[PDB]
A paper describes a structure:
The human monoclonal antibody C10 exhibits extraordinary cross-reactivity, potently neutralizing Zika virus (ZIKV) and the four serotypes of dengue virus (DENV1–DENV4). Here we describe a comparative structure-function analysis of C10 bound to the envelope (E) protein dimers of the five viruses it neutralizes. The neutralizing antibodies induced during a DENV or ZIKV infection target the envelope (E) protein and, with a few exceptions, are serotype specific. The epitopes are distributed evenly at the surface of the icosahedral virion, which is composed of 90 E dimers organized in 30 “rafts” of three parallel E dimers (Kuhn et al., 2002).
We determined the corresponding X-ray structures to 2.1-, 2.8-, 3.2-, and 2.7-Å resolution, respectively by molecular replacement. The crystals of ZIKV and DENV1 had one sE/C10 protomer in the asymmetric unit (AU), and a crystallographic 2-fold axis generated a symmetric sE dimer bound to two antibody fragments: Fab and scFv, respectively. Structural alignment of the X-ray snapshots above onto the core epitope of E in the available cryo-EM structures of the ZIKV virion at 3.1-Å resolution (Sevvana et al., 2018) and of the DENV2 virion at 2.6-Å resolution (Hardy et al., 2021) showed that the symmetric ZIKV and DENV1 (sE/C10V)2 half-dimers well matched the conformation of E on the virion. Docking of C10 on the E dimer observed in the crystal structure of the ZIKV sE/C10 complex is essentially the same as that on the 3f epitope on the ZIKV virion. The extent of the buried surface suggests an intrinsic inter-dimer affinity, which is reflected in the packing in the ZIKV sE/Fab C10 crystals, which showed sE dimers packed laterally through the same interfaces as in the virion rafts. The BSA is smaller (1,200 Å2), but the packing maintains the central hh’/bc loop contacts. With the sE dimers being less curved than E dimers on virions (left two columns), the packing in the crystals resulted in straight rows of dimers extending indefinitely. In the case of ZIKV and DENV1, the antibody can bind and stabilize a symmetric conformation of sE that is likely to be the most populated one.
Numbering used by the authors:
A (entry chain A), D (entry chain A): 1 to 152, 161 to 403
B (entry chain L), F (entry chain L): 3 to 9, 11 to 27, 27A, 27B, 27C, 28 to 95, 95A, 96 to 106, ...
C (entry chain H), E (entry chain H): 1 to 52, 52A, 53 to 82, 82A, 82B, 82C, 83 to 100, 100A, ...
Write the structure that this text describes.
């Protein structure tokens, strides 16, 4: 029943007596599979996981500087030098300044000056690599087994599909089992995609774009205190009037990066695993071992009661929840639609094949789904005098 | 935020209904309506959810319904074991949860009995010890649900008041006590009155 | 067998902070949100907040927005609620209760059957007092009694006439005041003919402070 | 002497017997003024100040959000609403999400959802307005009065020029006084310039550019807790799969702003006053009351000694510092250049008019500046047998 | 009249912090940088840093980079030096000294005549001790003496034979140890013929602790 | 960082020179060379700056010069009032300031006199009190400048040593004291020696 209420819902009808049914599962979608003499089954791709990612490279998009220092020399005394020039955490630059008797030099003219400042990253973004073999697709199945909405594993199963194990068989208790032969390697191509993390938000980006980012970077396996390459990308030096030189940081580039990510897929993180809420999986479902659990039940004879008002889903089907006064459960629910209440000739069809009451206890509930004809018809639940009806209009 | 009656009672074998009234943003807006049973000294137990659904194991004597902004829990065939506090709850449009005030359910094991009220002033020794408490004793009422109002010379008072939850006497009726805490000067400023409300009746005492 | 086991009772001073744990067994912890609901004595249930055990996301009631932190440890299958800047109004039993998250790992809408299992509850008493004995005052068919004021911690035991008088005796449960200290009273109903003739002594003892007190009550 | 050693040094020669001399003072420049029978004077614009600026407007270039909340409604129950929508610190947006029996709604379909989040500024930039009348130019004057480099107010004066007081007279003790008639209103036009402050750095920017900045802003007179207009400039909402909606902050725009400021003049702050290290002032100097202080001194007769090696400045002049053994001070320094040491015929000229020894104490020092001819010549200091010489080559 | 006046002496414990002030008069405070130079007792001068009073910019020696803050208050014409995380090596006289900034308000190159005026200096003693009396040991033409160990604070006064013996007597200035406590010794040169015959008693008293001690010295 | 001789002396009326040697980044690199005079108990006083310049008021008996990495302060016509410590200083290429070690200037009022050295072991009482100090007394030297070296069995020792600045005796020669602090066990491990150096001579004592 898990597709009931999903707007992006597809209905797939297999051939009577057929073995296979092709489906396309997409994040945000849900497929209801029907076939004659089989239980109706809802199937949905709920998660896509990437595991064992490897850190590729980190980029500093916001930096700061401190501990600025200078060395200066008189004209003809050569180039200035600071020992911070031998420290990779520092950025340095040389210029010339006017010197003379008034500031302590025996000769007049241009004296060398060098200025250094310690670079530190405020905020960085990290890129991690993806191996296509490390994908895992999680598929949920939910049988239309007459269970009602909000029941606190026979109607429900979880299946995991991987590149190395593209086939699964989900066992559905009394309903038998369903086979899945999927195509995980087809679809989203992680050949050229890195995983980018910035400020606890995540995207899938193209490698080519990631490798051409004009920002300081440190190596994937550089841990603890980082060593920044291309610090000059965020630091500039200015001089004024042959009197001094200062060092400034270019402001944060976070907005430029966010702008470049407008056309990119978004992702989340599950510990060390990446979780994508986008993508699809093409599967072939084997129906040979799927069975109707309650096809041998007797008819229910006691009185039904609507516990909710029947409700139209976005695709024109109708959901019906009823409470059953009797004790002869398990039993088949008499359920149909009719235009002529005297004939009780069936019109429309049910989506929930073989609606049943399961429990032998009184006042148990069940739910079913119907596909009414266009126009007016009566939903008829139960048999004989105590049957209940609900007049329906479709479109 | 959700309003339910303070007390409800019935004879064994009969039916009773407990209402729970909210607003269009909790009870009248969604089907996230639940009922919990709480016996003394234990955690609440889910009895109903989704307005009408029962967890497996909960007797079908319990049933639920909803109309506009009011939800209802009906218990038929009352048994002595159903005696407890009952709470409705709803998820809200804001993603929060709200509970009702709680309803004491009594399964009547004796005829209803009005309370006896006695009002003690501050003991002459207490004022000499520089504190003043006024004490209101309520005894021999059944069912055990009361509300108490304190008045200082015909005007309500809510500060300084504390009241106990009714406790069983040895004769199986109920008793309760209410204190009004005062400085010796406040007490000498004014009359003071304690009025108990039980099953719609009110008994009043003054000192 | 699903079980939620909470830590034992705690007494704390106003302004301090409490952290209470709730350990889950019998179900997969990361597939559920853990809610915290408190209940002041004699009062209604009050929802405080929840944490999604699978991804760590939380949601707090606006009443508790600043003072509450709810965390989780997945290895220990344990949820934690911490309340800071305590006041007298925080004295309550704190429960945890579960609800299932959806199959995408998110907790946007709850399930219809939220709070199907509850922890056993943890008593938290906010008071600034320290171990101290009570003050005993008198009170006077007729009803007489014994007022036992300003003690800490519980309990107090009261008898009448050293146990000779048991009939018509009722000792009330304690009341916790704005003081931060408990109070109670004990009442006995006796015939009015015996008032001036017969003596009625109230025996209150409070072992935490090891104080045994006897107090005559008379018109 | 303050121009000695400045690379951007201009020499201005007034007419003999002239009254006026036109000069152009620029930040980073220095002008040496010479005239027959007058002391040589150095003049320099050292500071330009803007006072009484008024705060115009502040822009948030980096923001953050917190206290995110949502309200949702079932289909046919109308639009969601949160009371945070009435709070100007919050940004809010509506969308639709799938609802149905499974999440507590009696009807299936699109339900209203609104999401709000509290906006806060991390970093802002402030624009202040300028009134042209509130400019102050500070001019330093330094007479070539034979004082040496590093002497611990007769040779030095400070003059202040304003739009309302464009004329000044600087008194130079024994040298008389110098008159200045300047054109402060001409020059840098503060008509269309605001003063921008960001991260304790400052620029002069154009008003047109400042008023078109696409960022949240608060009013100049909004103090304490700011009220942000156009918060939407840094906040966006996203939704996914008709299941949820989140709110995100656009990253810091600091780098875009820094980029737009590449072609802008930089400034500093002196308390509440703005200080510019760029600009100029055109002045006319009145020389009528300027006098030579030591024109009546007698010649020095005792021995001079070089205390430093004469040094060539960047413009080919030469500075000479000497110590004087005698006690007949104050006296005129015999000083010249010669190609023929027998003739002692003067060649070249002095920049320091009337070089003198001032003190009557022994072993006092003085400094002078010379303008040698091209080629070889002798610097000759003193008279007779004890005279000292230094052979010079120019170019 | 140019004057720089510094605050009075201070005693502090290792790990704590000192703040010393230097108030300038007779010249325009904002036109100058104020430097701090310290001098351990008996040792050389050591430059610590400077602040530009006109714009607040500072420069610290790398030896003092983390522990030193130099600030200024223009309204009070006062410079401040604060040294944190003190150690035994910080015991010194702290001086301020001025130098002029250029006419653009900047202090890139100093003037040639830097430090032309100095403050009077402020003694700072880093020690963990508290008021305590000394231990007195003996020491033996011949020279004998009195070792006065481990006292705090200064001073100690020493006489010999209650003042009868003054000739050939010399009392040394105190030494501050790694202990954090002072020590000194007093020596007297006497004839060797008198050693076994004549007695020599050393009178050390230390009033801070109010301790008067007399100690005989003999072979 | 700047090196100047420890002590310098001359007769009244004569000339003396105090050298100050640095590097190409302070004294050999710039003219920011200064000399300060410090009398006991007072702040330093600027005597020379810019290598050769005198502040107004400083007598012309003081003069300065510089050659390579060495600066020189010459004082002619020595007077008793010139007796003080003198310090050179330089601004550095790094924008810092460095001072020299300081030179004691003595104006000789009596012939030079070698020191008398006496070395006291730990007193027999001190070891019983669980501490051990060795004391070296130097007396009757002139001028008052010495260096002291402590040895533990013919090998240098620098830890535990403290030494006083020479102080005037009543007979106007100089005295000084040096302590070596030891645990009673260290002392019993080894000989110990104190050697004083005065005017290039060395006097040694051992215990
Ligand atoms: Ca690293
Ligand atoms: Ca405001």
């Amino acid at each position: 029943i898990r597709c009931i209420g999903v707007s992006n819902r597809d209905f797939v009808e297999g051939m009577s007596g057929g073995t296979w049914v092709d489906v396309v599962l997409e994040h945000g979608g849900c497929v209801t599979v029907m076939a004659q003499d089989k239980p109706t089954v809802d199937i949905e791709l709920v998660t896509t996981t990437v595991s064992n990612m490897a850190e590729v490279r980190s980029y500093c998009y916001e930096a700061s500087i401190s501990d600025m220092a200078s060395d200066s020399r008189c004209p003809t005394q050569g180039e200035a030098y600071l020992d911070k020039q031998s420290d990779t955490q520092y950025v340095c630059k040389r210029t010339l300044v006017d010197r003379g008797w008034g500031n302590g030099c025996g000769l007049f003219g241009k004296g060398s000056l060098v200025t250094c400042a310690k670079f530190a990253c405020s905020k960085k973004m990290t890129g991690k690599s993806i191996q296509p073999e490390n994908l895992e697709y999680r598929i949920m199945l939910s049988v239309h087994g007459s269970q009602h909405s909000g029941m606190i594993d026979e109607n429900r199963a979880k299946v995991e599909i991987t590149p190395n194990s593209p086939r699964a068989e989900a066992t559905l208790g009394g309903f038998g089992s369903l086979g899945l032969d999927c195509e995980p390697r087809t679809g989203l191509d992680f050949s050229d995609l890195y995983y980018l993390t910035m400020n606890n938000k995540h995207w899938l980006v193209h490698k080519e774009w990631f490798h051409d980012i004009p920002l300081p970077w440190h190596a994937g396996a550089d841990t603890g205190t980082p060593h920044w390459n291309n610090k000059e990308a965020l630091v500039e030096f200015k001089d004024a009037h042959a009197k001094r030189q200062t060092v400034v940081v270019l402001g944060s580039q976070e907005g430029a990066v966010h702008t470049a990510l407008a056309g990119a897929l978004e992702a989340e993180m599950d510990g060390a695993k990446g979780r994508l809420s986008s993508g699809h999986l093409k599967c072939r479902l084997k129906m040979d071992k799927l069975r109707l659990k309650g096809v041998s039940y007797s008819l229910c004879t006691a009185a039904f009661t609507f516990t909710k008002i029947p409700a139209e889903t976005l695709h024109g089907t109708v959901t019906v929840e009823v409470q059953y006064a009797g004790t002869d459960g398990p039993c088949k629910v008499p359920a149909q639609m009719a235009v002529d209440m005297q004939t009780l000739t069936p019109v429309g069809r049910l989506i929930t094949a073989n609606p049943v009451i399961t429990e032998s206890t009184e006042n148990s509930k069940m739910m079913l789904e119907l596909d009414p004809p266009f126009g007016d018809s009566y939903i008829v639940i139960g048999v004989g005098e105590k049957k209940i009806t609900h007049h329906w209009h479709r479109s | 935020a959700l309003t339910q009656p303070a007390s409800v009672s019935g004879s064994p074998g009969q039916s009773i209904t407990i209402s729970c009234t909210g607003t269009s943003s909790d009870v009248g807006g969604f089907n996230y309506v639940s009922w919990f049973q709480q016996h003394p000294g234990k955690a609440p137990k889910l009895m109903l959810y989704d307005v009408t659904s029962r967890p497996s194991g909960v007797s079908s004597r319990f049933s639920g319904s909803k109309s506009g902004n009011t939800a209802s829990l009906t218990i038929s065939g009352l048994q002595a074991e159903d005696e407890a506090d009952y709470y409705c709850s709803s998820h809200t449009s804001r993603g929060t949860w709200v509970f009702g005030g709680g309803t004491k359910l009594t399964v009547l094991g004796q005829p209803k009995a009005a309370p006896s009220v006695t009002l003690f002033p501050p003991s002459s020794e207490e004022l000499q010890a520089n504190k003043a408490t006024l004490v209101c004793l309520i005894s021999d009422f059944y069912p055990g649900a009361v509300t108490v109002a304190w008045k200082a010379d015909s005007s309500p008072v809510k500060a300084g008041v504390e009241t106990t939850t009714p406790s069983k006497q040895s004769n199986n009726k109920y008793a309760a006590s209410s204190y009004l805490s005062l400085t010796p000067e406040q007490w000498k400023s004014h009359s003071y009155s304690c009025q108990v409300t039980h099953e719609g009746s009110t008994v009043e005492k003054t000192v | 067998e699903v079980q939620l086991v909470e830590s034992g009772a705690e007494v704390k001073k106003p302004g301090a902070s409490v952290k209470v744990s709730c350990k889950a067994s019998g179900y997969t912890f990361t597939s559920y949100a853990m809610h915290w609901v408190r209940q002041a004595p004699g009062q209604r249930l009050e929802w405080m907040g929840w944490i999604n055990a699978g991804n760590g996301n939380t949601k707090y009631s606006q009443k508790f927005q600043d003072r509450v932190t709810i965390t989780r440890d997945t290895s220990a299958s344990t949820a934690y609620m911490e309340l800071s800047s305590l006041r007298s109004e925080d004295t309550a039993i704190y429960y945890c209760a579960r609800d299932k998250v959806d199959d995408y790992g998110d907790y946007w809408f709850p399930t219809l059957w939220y709070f199907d299992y509850w922890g056993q509850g943890t008593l938290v008493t906010v008071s600034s007092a320290s171990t101290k004995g009570p003050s005993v005052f008198p009170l006077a068919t007729a009803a007489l009694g014994c007022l036992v004021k300003d003690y800490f911690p519980e309990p107090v035991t009261v008898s009448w006439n050293s146990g000779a008088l048991t009939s018509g005796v009722h000792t009330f449960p304690a009341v916790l005041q704005s003081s931060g200290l408990y109070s109670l009273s004990s009442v006995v109903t006796v015939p009015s003919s015996s008032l001036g003739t017969q003596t009625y002594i109230c025996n209150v003892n409070h072992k935490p402070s090891n104080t045994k007190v006897d107090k005559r009550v008379e018109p």
